[PDB]
RNA sequence: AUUGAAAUC
RNA sequence: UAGUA
RNA sequence: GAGGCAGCAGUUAGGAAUCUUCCGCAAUGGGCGCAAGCCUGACGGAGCGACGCCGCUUGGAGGAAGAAGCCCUUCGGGGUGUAAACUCCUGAACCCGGGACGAAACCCCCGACGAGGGGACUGACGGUACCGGGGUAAUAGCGCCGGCCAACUCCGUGCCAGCAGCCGCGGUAAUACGGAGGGCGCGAGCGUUACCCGGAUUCACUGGGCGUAAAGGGCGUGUAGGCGGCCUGGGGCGUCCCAUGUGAAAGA
């Protein structure tokens, strides 16, 4: 089971995540299959969220449960918003 | 027998010029001819021409110097100051077009043999092809 | 692509198998000179169809033995028992080489 | 005008019965910082005159330095006995990067951007001459052009 | 930190008048008016032919000791230059000139870099309104270097602006005197400064 | 050598070796004295130069020099070795660190103080 | 003591 | 015989 | 019979030498669960150690033809030195007030358990960061000064005591030892020792050599191996060119 999820970059008290797909069994900040966005929980840039939303839809299509909070973000950039 | 006909040629030339001979022979090969025309075209030799000496083909190379110079030692400046074989039969040398060297901020030249034929470095850069880095002159 | 090599058969003194000598050449990594180098391969011959001296193509293949990993594709030219001769000499060279 | 930096002084020595006898040696450059330098070697009983002599001899010995913008035309290497020197052209911002000896020649010649290497026997005198003979051997697009024309 | 201790003492030693006290190292004694020779017992003694090293060294000590700066800090900027596009020598000077603690000086809000520093450390200064307290802050073009409207009423700020009331300033610096603010127009060019120092030697000191 | 030669033979990394078997790299080693003597130096020098034999935790036993103007070292002293030769005492290739273990710092020592292991006096304070 | 010593009284 | 030009 | 920290801590031993038996699942991530949740020394944090990098502090402006003290001195003088003392100014530390982002999901309701919309809970770090008010002149050391290499005088000492990276200093005038004054260089560091690259074109591919400096085999024969004259044609293995795929992330 492959997962859309968050990997942690940045520094101490400087969290910066990378929206990644990866086999569930890999380490959090381990190797990943593809980067498909990023996310700054502190919203310090005017651009603190981004998602290749075609790709997001691809990985879902081949089946890849997102972390509950990684799907929250995918929602925010309308990965699931249709019509 | 002779191990490097080309290297021998560059030398014959090198040797003749330092005693300021007006001319040298070098036994003849078409590949030798092709190098000669570069020297010729690029202004290092007055020119070559074919002759048959003692019954066999040579190329008579006509050398080219400077004006009689001023003070003690009036020997002319050489036009060919430095002719040097690069790709010897011992260690063959090949640049691709990216690695073709520019001899002496351009004031030099590097005869260089390609599938488009025997070329100067700028000629070959322009034609976009590398090959056997034959020698260099200046 | 299954790597396809071509060498010389230098032994068929095995059942359904030929030793093939593949020679390779290249710019020496540090010293420039083009050096030659070579490797014998054990190649699979189900019809004992090839013999001493045939120059043969040779293909990367499904394992047949511990060390049989290639099958004999086509034959390029018969004869060439000169190349065979050269391998055989290097061998008995080693004889006059011990203590 | 002519600037003059002294590179080396040394105290040599001969032998006469009962005691040593000294002399002195003077390595001095002179330059206008506009493509004209000279080098001289002065020898004399006392330093001052050795220096002063060096000066005299240096002006008597000057050179063409084709100065394609603070650097030199192309890359010469020159061997003087066991001393080699390599000169390499550099873009501005670099500097005269060399040893005390090649530097103070190159500088007083009106060079500002140059790359060098003392190779082999680094004896200053021999190094010094080499460097001059390197300068003295520099050519330019013009001269080469004149040469090969005919 | 910084330097600490005797300043218009290096006024001397370098042999060229340094302004490190501002007002006095400027007025009939930076001691260069009295004893323009190096300090200590062997001061007014005969110099010797200084070495090609000694020479490059002092020139660096000269340039650095001007701007009041750490060797470790100085040297980072230098290397930080060089690899950066263009003529190393100047650019370095540029970057040195772009230090707040110095702009503040250059822009008249203080009489010395030393005093100018303290104003930065005590937040008396702002860049684009936000209060800055780093003497190292690299001022880029367009930035406005304000006085803290909170600090305006200091006897030191008043008195030191009333002096620049008439005074003209840097061909790369603007200055509104009454609203106590100035501008960083552009990096200076070597010629813009009359720095009593040969930057080419400073390049050489860090080459050997 | 010809290129073929270099191709057959290559070159060879000279890699000359340690001046200090204080073993395992080891920037320092601990040791116990065995013998504290005095040694006549050599070449063109003369003086009664102090030096100890040391039994090493590296399994070794080496003579090490005792710097400083006077010392507190006798037979079973236990000490730290730092390396650095003497030169005038042939065969002495290590120094003793003063101010570590039973080797005291040097008394009344005001100048090069961190070497010789002598703490800052408060006499001018 | 001699020459700074070693030797030597 | 030692250091010492 | 029981056991197996090279999980986190910690103990002990070896060693020149390496941390807290800490807080929290709040975040990210993993397991199980329809869910609520339960588990997680992965983790997220605090602790210790100048071990490293970066920022910052020990003040700022005035202030004598120049206090004293100490150091020289040819006995007039020179130096430490605007340094201090002293006058103004700012106000690291410290006190009070306020006070985070990091956390919106899973979940509930509406809609259809979808899309979309609405609501609720939750912070270890932490009363820390940051903001506002008050406010004290408030830490400096270490190495070096014969040449290389930047910085010199005076005592003490007399091949002694000692120094020394190499060259070398010391035998009664020592810029080299020990000390003081001064000076140079760095600065919360400065030195030392160990190790790696450098310089070293001193294993030389780029880039070295062998008459006397180290270096031609005592001489041949010829094995493998290296190397190969002039002309033409075929093949395209070396070589060269174009396109394309690969060259994960981090790093530069």
Q: Residue D78 belongs to what H/E stretch?
A: strand D77-80
Q: For strand I, list residues 81-100 of chain E whose Cβ lies within 7 Å of it.
A: none
Per-residue DSSP letter, D99: -
Closest CB from E88, E204, E207 relative to D93: E88
**What are the boundaries of each domain within chain E?**
1-96+194-208, 97-193
A15 CB inside 7 Å of strand I: yes
Q: Which of D44, D64, D84 is the last residue of a domain?
A: D64
- Structure tokens of B21? 């001979």
Question: What DSSP character marks residue C48?
Answer: -
Task: Characterize the bridge pairing of strands D62-64 and D77-80.
Answer: unpaired
**Cα dihedral E12→E14→E20→E21 (10° resolution):** 0
What number of other Cβ atoms are within 10 A of residue F53's Cβ? 16
Same domain, B115 and B131: yes
Look at strands D96-97 and D114-120 and give their pairing. Answer: parallel
Q: Whole-angstrom Cα distance, residue B87 to residue B135?
A: 7
Q: Which of F46, F91, F47 is nearest to F65 (CA)?
A: F91
F105-121: buried (b, 16+ CB within 10 Å) or exposed (e) per residue?
A: ebeebeeeeeebbbeee
How many inter-chain contacts (B to C, CB under 8 Å) are there?
Answer: 9
Contact D30, D1 (CB under 8 A): no
Give every CB contact of residue E122 below 8 A, 6+ residues apart in sequence: E133
Is strand I less than 7 A from the beta carbon of E71? yes
In b/e form, how buried is each residue of D58-67, taking b as 16+ CB within 10 angstroms? beeeebebeb
Other chains touching D, judged by 3 or more CB pairs under 8 Å: B, E
Nearest to E157 by CA among E193, E188, E126, E129: E126
* Cβ–Cβ under 8 Å, residues D36 and D1: no
Task: Find the radius of gyration of the CA atoms of chain C.
Answer: 15
Q: DSSP secondary-structure letter at E177?
A: T
* Distant-in-sequence, close-in-space partners of F56: CB < 8 Å, separation ≥ 6: F22, F23, F29, F30, F31, F62, F81
Do B17 and B71 lie in one domain? The reply is yes
* Counted domains in chain A: 1
Same domain for B86 and B121?
yes
Output b/e per residue, E71-95; b: 16+ Cβ within 10 A.
Answer: eeebeebbeebbeeeebbbbbbbbb
How many other C-beta atoms can be found within 10 angstroms of the C-beta atom of residue F79?
21
Is the minimum CB–CB distance between E50 and chain D shorter than 8 Å?
no
Query: Of B132, E106, A74, E141, which is closest to residue E125 (Cα–Cα)?
Result: E106
Binding positions of E are: 8, 11, 25, 30
Indicate if CB(F91) is under 7 A from strand I.
Answer: no
Assign D3 to helix, strand or coil.
coil
Pull the structure tokens for residue B27: 């036994």
- How many domains is chain D built from? 2
CATH number assigned to the domain comprising residue F14: 2.40.50.140
CA–CA dist C56, C84 (Å, integer): 13
Of B63, B80, B97, which closes a domain?
A: B80
Strands of E5-164 (E only): list them: 125-127, 130-131, 144-147
Provide the residue range defining the domain that includes D59. Answer: 1-64
Judged by 3 or more CB pairs under 8 A, whether B touches C is yes
Query: What is residue E6's three-state secondary structure?
Result: coil
Question: Coil, helix or strand for B112?
Answer: strand
**Cβ-based contacts under 8 A for chains D and E:** 16
**Cβ contacts of D41-44, under 8 Å, gap ≥ 24:** D41/D125
Contact assessment for residue D42 and residue D55, using Cβ atoms and an 8 Å cutoff: yes
Structure tokens that stand for F86 in this block? 């003497």
Asked if the Cβ–Cβ distance from C35 to F3 is below 8 Å, we say: no
Residues 6+ away with beta carbon under 8 Å from E182: E103, E107, E108, E109, E144, E145, E169, E173, E174, E175, E176
**Residue D32 to residue D110: CA distance in whole angstroms:** 7
Breaks (C-N over 2.5 A) in chain F follow: none
Of the CA atoms within 13 Å of residue F73, those in its CB half-sphere come to 35
Q: Which of A62, A12, A63, A9 is nearest to A37 (CA)?
A: A9
Q: Are residues B17 and B68 located together in one domain of the fold?
A: yes
- Kindly report the nearest CA distance between residue D19 and chain E, in angstroms: 31
Q: Which residues of F touch C (CB under 8 A)?
A: 3-4, 6-7
Spatial distance between the Cα atoms of E206 and D94, rounded to a whole number of angstroms = 12
The residues with which B61 forms a beta bridge, in sequence order, are: B24, B48
Alpha carbons D126 and B99: distance in angstroms, whole number? 35
* Alpha-carbon separation of residue F13 from C28, F10, F16, F80 (angstroms): 20, 10, 9, 34
Selection from D54, D39, D51, D34 nearest residue D107 by Cα = D34
F14 three-state secondary structure: coil
DSSP per-residue codes, A9-51: EEETTEEEEEEEEEETTS-TTS--SEEEEEE-TT--SS--EEE
User: Any idea of the CA torsion for A55, A56, A60, A61, to the nearest 10 degrees?
Assistant: -30
Number of Cβ within 10 Å of residue A36's Cβ equals: 23
How many residues does this entry show for chain A? 83
Q: Which architecture does CATH list for E97-193?
A: Roll (3.10)
Helical pair D100-108 and D124-135, crossing angle rounded to 10 deg: 30
CA E161 to chain centre: 19
For E87, nearest residue in chain D (alpha carbons): D93
Helices E71-80 + E52-67 axis angle, to 10: 100
Angle at D25 between CA D20 and CA D29, to 5 degrees: 175
End-to-end CA distance of chain C: 46
Query: Rounded to 5, what percent of chain E is helix, strand, coil?
Result: 35, 10, 55
User: How do beta strands C68-71 and C75-77 pair?
Assistant: unpaired
The annotated binding site of E for Zn(2+) is made up of: 8, 11, 25, 30
Exposure string for D122-133, b = 16+ CB within 10 A, e = fewer: ebbbbbbbbbbe
F16 touches strand I (CB under 7 A): no
Q: What is the span of the domain harbouring residue C55?
A: 1-99
Q: From CA F48, how far away is CA F69, in angstroms rounded? A: 12
Q: In which domain, by residue range, is B112 found?
A: 81-138
Cα distance from B56 to chain D (closest Cα, Å)? 31
Fold of E1-96+194-208: Ribosomal Protein S4 Delta 41; Chain A, domain 1 (1.10.1050)
Q: Protein A53 CA to nucleic acid I111 C1', in Å?
A: 25
Q: Which two tokens stand for residue E22?
A: 């501002």
Residues of chain C whose beta carbon is less than 8 angstroms from a beta carbon of chain F are: 28, 31-33, 35
Domain count, chain C: 1
| Owning domain of residue F120 | 1-125
Helices (H), C1-99: 81-93
Residue D13 domain-assigned (yes or no): yes
| Residue A58 CB coordination number (10 Å) | 14
CATH number at residue A60: 3.30.1320.10
Gap between the Cα atoms of D30 and F113, Å rounded: 49
Q: How far apart, in whole angstroms, are the C-alpha atoms of residue E108 and residue E168?
A: 10
Cα separations (Å) of A35 from A32, A72, A79, B30? Answer: 7, 17, 15, 61
For residue B53, list its beta bridge partners. Answer: B56
What gap in Å lies between CA D129 and CA D126, rounded to an integer? 5
Structural contact between residues E32 and E11, judged by C-beta atoms closer than 8 angstroms: yes
Taking a C-beta distance cutoff of 8 angstroms, is the pair D89, D72 a contact? Answer: yes
Quick one: which of F92, F118, F121, F86 has its CA closest to F104?
A: F118
């Amino acid at each position: 089971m492959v997962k859309i999820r968050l990997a942690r970059f940045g520094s101490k008290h400087n969290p910066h995540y990378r929206i990644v797909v990866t086999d569930a069994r890999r380490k959090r900040d381990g190797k990943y299959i593809e980067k498909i966005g990023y996310y700054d929980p502190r919203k310090t840039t005017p651009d603190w969220l981004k998602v290749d939303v075609e790709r997001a839809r691809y990985w879902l299509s081949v089946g890849a449960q997102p972390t509950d909070t990684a799907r929250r973000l995918l929602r925010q950039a309308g990965v699931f918003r249709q019509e | 027998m002779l191990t490097d006909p080309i290297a021998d040629m560059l030398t014959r030339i090198r040797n003749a010029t330092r005693v300021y001979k007006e001319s040298t022979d070098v036994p003849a090969s078409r590949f030798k001819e092709e190098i000669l025309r570069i020297l010729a075209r690029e202004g290092f030799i007055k020119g070559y021409e074919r002759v048959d000496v003692d019954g066999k083909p040579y190329l008579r190379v006509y050398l080219k110097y400077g004006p009689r110079r001023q003070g003690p030692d009036p020997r002319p400046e050489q036009v060919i100051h430095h002719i040097r074989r690069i790709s010897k039969p011992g260690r063959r040398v090949y640049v691709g077009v990216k690695e073709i060297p520019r001899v002496r901020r351009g004031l030099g030249i590097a005869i260089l043999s390609t599938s488009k034929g025997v070329l100067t470095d700028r000629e070959a850069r322009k034609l976009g092809v590398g090959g056997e880095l034959i020698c260099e002159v200046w | 692509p299954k790597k396809v090599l071509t060498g010389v058969v230098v032994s068929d003194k095995m059942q359904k198998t030929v030793t093939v000598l593949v020679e390779r050449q290249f710019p020496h990594p540090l010293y420039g000179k083009v050096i030659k180098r070579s490797k014998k391969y054990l190649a699979h011959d189900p019809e004992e169809k090839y013999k001493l001296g045939d120059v043969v193509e040779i293909i990367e293949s499904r394992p047949i033995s511990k060390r049989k990993r290639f099958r004999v594709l086509r034959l390029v030219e018969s004869g060439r028992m000169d190349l065979v001769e050269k391998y055989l000499i290097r061998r008995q060279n080693y004889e006059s080489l011990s203590k | 005008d002519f600037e003059e930096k002294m590179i080396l002084i040394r105290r040599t020595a001969r032998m006469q019965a009962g005691g040593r006898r000294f002399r002195f040696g003077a390595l001095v450059v002179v330059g206008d910082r506009q493509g004209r330098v000279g080098l001289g070697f002065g020898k004399a009983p006392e330093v001052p005159l050795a220096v002063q002599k060096a000066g005299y001899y240096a002006r008597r010995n000057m050179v063409e330095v084709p100065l394609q913008n603070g650097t030199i035309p192309h890359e010469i290497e020159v061997e003087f006995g066991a001393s080699k020197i390599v000169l390499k052209p550099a873009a501005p911002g670099t500097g005269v990067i060399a040893g005390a000896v090649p530097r103070a020649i190159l500088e007083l010649a009106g060079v500002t951007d140059i790359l060098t290497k003392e190779l082999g026997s680094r004896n200053p005198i021999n190094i010094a001459y080499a460097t001059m003979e390197a300068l003295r051997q520099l050519r330019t697009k013009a001269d080469v052009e004149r040469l090969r024309k005919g | 930190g910084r330097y600490i201790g005797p300043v218009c003492r290096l006024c001397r030693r370098e042999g060229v008048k340094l302004y490190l006290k501002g007002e006095r190292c400027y007025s009939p004694k930076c001691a260069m008016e009295r004893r323009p020779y190096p300090p200590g017992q062997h001061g007014q003694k005969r110099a010797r032919r200084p070495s090609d090293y000694a020479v490059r060294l002092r020139e660096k000590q000269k340039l650095r000791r001007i701007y009041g700066i750490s060797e470790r800090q100085f040297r980072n900027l230098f290397e930080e230059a060089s690899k950066k596009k263009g003529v190393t020598g100047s650019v370095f000077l540029g970057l040195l000139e772009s230090r707040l603690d110095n702009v503040v000086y250059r822009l008249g809000f203080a009489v010395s870099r030393r005093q100018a520093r303290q104003l930065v450390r005590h937040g008396h200064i702002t860049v684009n309104g936000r209060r800055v307290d780093l003497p190292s802050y690299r001022v880029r073009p367009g930035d406005e270097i304000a006085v803290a409207e909170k600090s305006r009423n200091l006897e030191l700020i008043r008195q030191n602006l009333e002096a620049m009331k008439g005074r003209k300033v840097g061909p790369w610096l603007s200055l509104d005197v009454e609203g106590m603010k100035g501008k960083f127009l552009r990096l200076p060019d070597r010629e813009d400064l009359a720095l009593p120092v040969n930057e080419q030697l400073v390049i050489e000191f860090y080459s050997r | 050598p010809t290129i073929n030669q270099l191709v057959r033979k290559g070159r060879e990394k000279v890699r000359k070796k340690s001046k200090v078997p204080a073993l395992k790299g080891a920037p320092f080693r601990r040791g116990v004295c065995t013998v504290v003597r005095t040694v006549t130096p050599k070449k063109p020098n003369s003086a009664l130069r102090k030096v100890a034999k040391v039994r090493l935790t590296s399994g070794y036993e080496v003579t090490a020099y005792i710097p400083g103007e006077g010392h507190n070292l006798q037979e079973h002293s236990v000490v730290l070795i730092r390396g650095g030769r003497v030169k005038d005492l042939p065969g002495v290739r290590y120094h003793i660190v003063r101010g570590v273990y039973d080797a005291a710092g040097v008394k009344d020592r005001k100048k090069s103080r961190s070497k010789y292991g002598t703490k800052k006096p408060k006499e001018a304070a």
